[PDB]
């Protein structure tokens, strides 16, 4: 999250308190199809990877 | 001397006169805006980082380097041999008589070498520099100079380097250990500085003396 | 000596002048972006 | 004037999260810490003493 | 001596200049990938 | 100037999780720690003393 | 320069789980710890003293 914020233009000081609740770290997996052309779309699977309770209404960045 | 005219460090006029604003145009409005110099798009939530030529940026000089080395070696050797026939029996007098076989010898050797070296330096302060070029990958070349004159002489603190924008903190400041081609300089003039150069004769001897 | 002219470690000019931005194109927009690298 | 020069080869997967690497993880490390001025000149041996240190019998 | 020119341990230039990236191809994409080794 | 040189043969299954091996697990270990300059020259024996150390009777 | 040389014969069922054997389980153990340089030369006896140590009457 700090990497993303820094990339966007906001530098959070280091060694500071930060406890979020609406964010989860996920692994995304997909299947590259045959003869795939750039611009097309595929379906992805999103899976939690640490101590999260649910991904009910989330959005993948 | 103190009567020889010298120019001050801060030259020119040290005051400015306010200029009267323009006469308001007689539309139906009370709000009158003097000609506003339009500056470009400015983000709202992003930190104030320098982005173009001429922007300022604070450097926090904190340098602390310290290196050292040493070594040694040694060696030693002793030896001491002896032999003495005090009372020789008669039947042996033809071989060990008249002290013809007594012997005594000694020997020694020693060596000790050693050496070492070290170096160190520190630096602490704060200095605001200015961007003078934007590189092809977003890095900023920065240069800066601060001149002080406390009652007798003049000290100069100059700085130059290259900064990566993603290292600038939220308060528009970078520690000097994150600058790539750091050139720092802290010099002075006046007789206080002249009292710290070696005399030409001593400087010559320091280089050409045999020892 | 201290009177012999030597060059400083940081050479060249130690200041820069800001350059005026481009004149905004007269589309219907307030957002004007100078040529972005 | 003091000069600190460095040269080496770095493996990207060793760089920390703050864009920093300890110098013990660099392969062909060349480090140099030298100086000039009369402070540095006061630490070279005299040519006669340097000659004796090499050619003296003991 | 201290005036005899010697070469430093770290030789050559101790700085590098960033090179401008390639011009993006005008497909319908924002993602442009420079030639990846 | 000090030089630390190393050469050897490593078995991959001995490399730790942090890409590191203790030097006691290298087979043909050649380690070298030498230097130059007058600090190193002040630690060689004089040629006369070196000659005596070998050819003296005692 | 110091040299540590080793030679021997090992029975595989004595190798531990970490690929290590204590040297007391090797059959024809030949161990050698020698050196060279003047530090080693300062530990040989002089030829005259060596001669006397063998041929002196007492």
Give the SSE layout.
This is part of a larger assembly, with 1 copy of chain A (61 residues) and 6 copies of chain B.
Chain A: H1 2-8, E1 26-30, E2 44-48
Antiparallel strand pairs in A: 1-2
Chain B: E1 56-83, H1 93-96, E2 103-134, E3 140-148, E4 154-163, E5 173-175, E6 183-189, H2 191-194, H3 200-208
In short:
Chain A is flat and about 50 Å long. Helix content of chain A is 11%, strand content 16%.
Radius of gyration of chain B: 39 Å
Strand order of the largest sheet of chain B: 5-1-2-3-4-6
Helical residue percent band of chain B: under 10%
Distance between the termini of chain B: 41 Å
Structural class from helices and strands of chain B?
Answer: mainly beta
Structural class by sheet pairing and helices of chain A: alpha+beta
* Elements of chain A, N to C (H/E): HEE
Radius of gyration of chain A: 16 Å
Shape of chain B: elongated
Structure annotation, total helices of chain B: 3
Q: Distance N terminus to C terminus of chain A? A: 11 Å
Beta-strand segment tally of chain B: 6
Biggest sheet layout of chain B: 6 strands, mixed
PDB class: motor protein
Keywords: Flagella, Hook-basal body, motor protein
Entry title: Cryo-EM structure of the flagellar motor-hook complex from Salmonella
Chain A: Flagellar P-ring protein
């Amino acid at each position: 999250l700090n990497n993303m914020l820094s990339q966007l233009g906001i530098t959070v000081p280091t060694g500071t308190n930060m406890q979020l609740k609406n964010v989860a770290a996920v692994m995304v997996t997909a299947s590259y199809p045959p003869f795939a052309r750039q611009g097309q779309t595929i379906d992805v699977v999103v899976s939690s990877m640490g101590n999260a309770k649910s991904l009910r209404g989330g959005t993948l960045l | 001397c103190a009567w020889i005219p010298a120019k001050p460090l801060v030259q020119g006029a040290t005051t400015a006169q306010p200029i009267p604003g323009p006469v308001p145009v007689a539309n139906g409005s009370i709000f009158q805006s003097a000609q506003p110099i339009n500056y470009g798009y400015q983000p709202l939530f992003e930190d104030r980082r320098p982005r173009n030529i001429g922007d300022t940026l604070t450097i926090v000089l904190q340098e602390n380097v310290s290196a050292s080395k040493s070594s040694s070696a040694n060696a030693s050797r002793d030896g001491k041999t002896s032999f003495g026939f005090d009372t020789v029996p008669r039947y042996l007098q033809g071989l060990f008589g008249n002290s013809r076989a007594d012997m005594e010898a000694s020997g020694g050797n020693s060596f000790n070498g050693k050496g070492g070296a070290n170096a160190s330096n520190t630096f602490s302060g704060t200095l605001t520099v200015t961007v003078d070029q934007v590189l092809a990958n977003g890095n900023l070349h920065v240069v800066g100079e601060k001149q002080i004159a406390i009652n007798q002489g003049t000290e100069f603190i100059r700085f130059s380097g290259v900064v990566n924008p993603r290292t600038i903190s939220g308060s528009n400041s970078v520690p000097s250990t994150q600058v790539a081609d750091a050139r720092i300089e802290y010099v002075g003039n006046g007789y206080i500085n002249e009292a710290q150069n070696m005399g030409w004769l001593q400087r010559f001897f320091l280089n050409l003396s045999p020892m």
